C-alpha cells in the first residue's frame, strides 16, 4: 500500500528511515505522506505523536508502527534491529491490527473546538487560582481547586496520569481516568482525592467559577484558551489503529519500562 | 415471588423489617428464605455484604436491595422512609435489573478452593515478611514485597481500593484493581507502585517465595490458608443483581458518600 | 508603639480596621507604616504574606497579628469578635512573642538575588520539560524530571506543601521541606518520591541541565527567572515574630482547619 | 576497651567475625559481651536492630558499629572490605561519635510497659476494625479508623515510614513522624491524611474506642497487648551513639540505596 515514515530528527533516525525505505523499494509499495496507508514512526513515543496527530482525520484508513531508536516506548515499542523483518511483513502484509480507544475534548467558548488526544488531556489555569466545578453527566459531582485536572487515556495511564497518581488500564478497556494535579482539601473545600475511571458515553464537563482563562494541553500541544465556558471530556468513537507484527504484551510492556529491562 | 429480609440485629432494623413482612402479607409474596428471589437487607453495607454472601450459589435467582438504617451505603443505598414506597414497587414486580461484576479467587494447595467477592479480596502475611511474585497472564510481572496486595470489584473501589490509593471505577465496567499495601521499593526491591486495573479474562496470579503461609480475606470473612502455592483473581462470570426502583447514578452516591450529603 | 493595619480591602476588613484604629486612638499609640512595631492583618493568609512581604527587612522589629474576616487561617487566626480584646492588650504590650523559622532563597544568574518565604517558593519550567539536578551539601542526589519541586517552610507545610503529599511540621522545628510535582519513574528515570526534611544549615541546590528559564514562586508572588544558574535553598536565619494572647496551639489550628471546627 | 560482634549467623559473617576478633586479639582489646563498650554488628540493619535492643539498657555507654555483609543498610553501612581498617581506627580509639534521637512508647493497662525503639512503633487491630482517638498534647486531634499507625524515628522515615508515604528527616532532627494505614475518609470519618512531624515534648496518646486489644511492634518485636488503656509516643531523651571513622552523609546513604549505588 501507500506509507510513510517521520523521524525524530536526529542521525539514527534519518538513516534508519532511509534504509527502510530502500528496503521498501524492494516491493510494491509506494511512498506517500499524503494519503499513507502506514505510517512507521523513528523514535521516541514523542515522535509516534506526532505521527499519530499528522494524520488524525485518517485514523480508520492508518495502522501506526513505532520504531523507538532510543528507549524502549509504549507506542514506539520495536527495536531498530528489528527493521528489515519489519518491512518484509509490513510489505507481504496480511497482519493483524490492534485499536486503542481515544479521548475527545470540547471545548466551547461564547465558538467550539474538539480535538482528539492519544495519551491525556489537561486542564491547568493561567496564572491565577485553578478552580472548576466537576459535572459528570450533568450531576455536579465536586468543586475541585488547585492546579488542574488530567484525563488519561488506557494507554495513557502509564504516561502523565502514572506520575498524578492514578492506576495503569489495559488499553482494551474502553474508558479514560481523571487525575487530580495538587488538590487543596480542608474543612471548606473538598474534592474526591481518587482518580477517577469513567466508562464510555459518560461524559465529563469540567466549567469555570471565576477565571475564564485556561492553560489546555491535548497529548504536547498545550495552548491557552481565552473567554473559556465548558471542557467536555468523553470517550471517542474513533480508534487509533497499530499493526502487530509479533506478541508484546501491555503489561510486558509495563514490566520492561518501570520494573527492568 | 419468594422473597426474605436479613436485618443488622438492632432494633431499628428488626422493627422496619416485620413493617416491610406485614406491609408484604397484602400481596401474593411468600416470606422464604431457602429459595427467595428478593433479598432485602436492612443496615449497612456490611449487612448487605453479609447477605450476598449467604445466597452467592443461587446469585442468577436474585435481585438484592439495600435500605440503610445508618448512613447511606453504597449497596444499602435506598433511605427507610421508602420502605413502604419500596414494598409495593417489589410487590408489583415489573422493575429493572442492574449487574455488577463480581471477583472471582482461586485459592490452591498441595487442592482448590474458589470464592467470590463483591468489594474485594486481599492477601496478606501470617506475621512475617510478605514477599509475592506476581504472574499476569503466565508472565512474571513484579516481585511484591510488602504488607499485601488488594483485589478489587468495581463497586468495591469505593470501599479498601480507595483507602490503598486506588481508582473509582464505574461498576459498568467489567473489570478488576489492584492496589498495594505499604512497598518496600529501594535499589534491590522494585514494584510498579500505581495501581493496575485488568480487563475479563485477564488472570492475576500470587505466588509465593519463601513462606506459604498467608493471611487471605474475602470481603469481610478472613482466614489463614496453610501450604498455599497459588492465588488466582479473576473477573467472575457470575454477577450480582441489584432491583432498581429509581434513578441513583453510582458518581451521585459517590458525591453524597465523600463530597457532602 | 507605632502600628500600621492592612486590610483585604472588602468591606467588613475596612471597616474592622478603621474601629481598631478608633480604639488604638484611646492609648498612646501612634499610626505608623513606615517603621512600625505592631502589624496587624485583617483578611486570610494571604492578607497576611502580604503584610510579612511588605515589612520583610524589618522582621526582627515587629510582631505580626493575623485576623480572619472569613474562614479561619493559620497565620490569620484570631477572630473579629475578638478585636477589642486584641486592641487593648497590644495596647498596655508586655506580650509574649512567637517565632517561625523562614526559607532563604538564592538565585544566581550569568548576579544573585535572594529571596525570604514564609509558605514556600517552588521551582516549575516555562513552557517545555522541567529536568534539575538536586544537590544537597554540594553532594548530587538526584535528576529530577516532572512539573516542578517546592521547599517548604513548617508554616508552610498546612499549605501547598501538603497538596504535594507533605508532611505537616510544628513550627517549633528548624527546618525546611521539599516535595516532588508530578515526577516521572521509570527505568531510566529516577527520584526519590518521598518528601525530604532538612534541618537549619543544610543547603539545597538546584542546577539546571538544559533549559535555564524557569518559573520561580515565593509565597504569591510568582516571577520567570531568565539566564539562571542556581537556585539555593536553606532555612533563614531571620525569623517572623508573631505576638501571642492567647493560647491556640498548632496542631489545635491543624484539626479545626482540616478536621472540623 | 570492651567490645562484642553479633552476627547475622550466616557462613560470611560468622567468618568475618572471627576475623575481626583475631585482629582485635593483637591489641589490648577485651572480648566481653556484658558490658561491652563497642558493639559491632555483622549482617543488616535487622542484625544491627538485634545488637541495639539487646544493649537497649546501656546506650550511653555504647558505641555502635554497622558492617553490611549484604546489600548497604542504612545502620549497617560499612563495606566488609574496609573491617581491618576498622578494626584498628577502633583499636586506637580517639573516634568520634554521632548521635540518633530514638523513640520512647509507653502502653498503660488497667500497669505500665515503656520501649525503645531505633526505627518507629506501630499499632495494629487484632482481627477486627481498628479504631483509635489520637491526642495530640491532651488535645484531641482525630478519631482514626483504618488499618494502623507508626509512629517513627528520624532514622527510621527511611524505612517503614517511608512506605506508608511518610518524608525522609535527616537524623539530626530531634523529632518524630506519624504516618497512617488506609485510612477511611468519607463524610462520616476524617483523618488529616498528612504524616505528622512532632518535636521533642510532645505527646502523641492513642487512646482506644470500643476494642482494647492492639498488635503493637517496636522495631521488629511484635505482641499482642490486651486490655490496653492508652500508647503515649514521644521523643526519647536517651540516644544511641554511633563511633565514625569515615564520612558518610545521611543524604548520600540514601542516595545509594534508593537512586543507584
Ligand atoms: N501542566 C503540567 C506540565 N507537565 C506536562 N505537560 C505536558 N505533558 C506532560 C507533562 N508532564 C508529563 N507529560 C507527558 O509528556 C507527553 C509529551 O509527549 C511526549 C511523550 C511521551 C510519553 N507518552 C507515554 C506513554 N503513553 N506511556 C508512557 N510513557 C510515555 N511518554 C514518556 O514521556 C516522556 C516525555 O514527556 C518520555 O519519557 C516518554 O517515554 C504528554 O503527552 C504527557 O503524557
Ligand atoms: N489487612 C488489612 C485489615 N483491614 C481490613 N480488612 C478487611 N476489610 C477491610 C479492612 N479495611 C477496610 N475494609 C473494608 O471493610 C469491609 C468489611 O465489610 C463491611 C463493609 C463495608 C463497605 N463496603 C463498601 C463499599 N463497597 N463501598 C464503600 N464503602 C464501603 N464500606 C464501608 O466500610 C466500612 C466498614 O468496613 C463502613 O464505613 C462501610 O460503609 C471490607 O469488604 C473492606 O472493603
Ligand atoms: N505551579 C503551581 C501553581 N499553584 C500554586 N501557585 C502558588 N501558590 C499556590 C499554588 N497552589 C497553592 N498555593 C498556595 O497559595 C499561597 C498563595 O498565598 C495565599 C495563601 C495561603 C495560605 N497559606 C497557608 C498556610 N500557611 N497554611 C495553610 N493554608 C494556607 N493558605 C491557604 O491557601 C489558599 C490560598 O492560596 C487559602 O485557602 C488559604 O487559606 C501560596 O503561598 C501557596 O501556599
Ligand atoms: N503491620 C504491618 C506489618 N509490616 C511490617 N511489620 C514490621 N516491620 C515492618 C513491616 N514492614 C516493614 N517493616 C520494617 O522492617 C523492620 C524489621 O527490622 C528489620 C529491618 C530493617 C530496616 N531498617 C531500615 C532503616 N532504618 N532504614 C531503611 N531501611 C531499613 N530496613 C530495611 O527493611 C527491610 C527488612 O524489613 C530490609 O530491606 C532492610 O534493609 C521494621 O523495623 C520496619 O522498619
Redesign the interface.
Known sequence: MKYMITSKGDEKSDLLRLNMIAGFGEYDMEYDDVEPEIVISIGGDGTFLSAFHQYEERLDEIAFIGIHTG?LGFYADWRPAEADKLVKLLAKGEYQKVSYPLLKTTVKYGKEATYLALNESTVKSS?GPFVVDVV??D????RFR??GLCMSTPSG?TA?N?????????P??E?M?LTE????????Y??????????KH?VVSLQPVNDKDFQISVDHL?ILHRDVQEIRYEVSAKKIHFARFRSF?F??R????????
Open positions: 528507549h496564572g459528570i453527566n450531576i455536579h459531582f465536586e488547585g492546579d495511564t502523565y502514572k506520575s498524578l497518581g492514578g492506576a495503569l488500564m489495559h482494551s478497556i474508558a481516568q494535579m495538587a488538590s487543596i482539601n480542608n474543612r471548606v473538598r474534592t474526591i482525592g481518587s482518580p477517577l475511571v469513567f466508562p459518560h498545550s504484551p503489561w510486558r509495563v514490566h520492561d519500562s518501570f520494573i527492568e529491562d
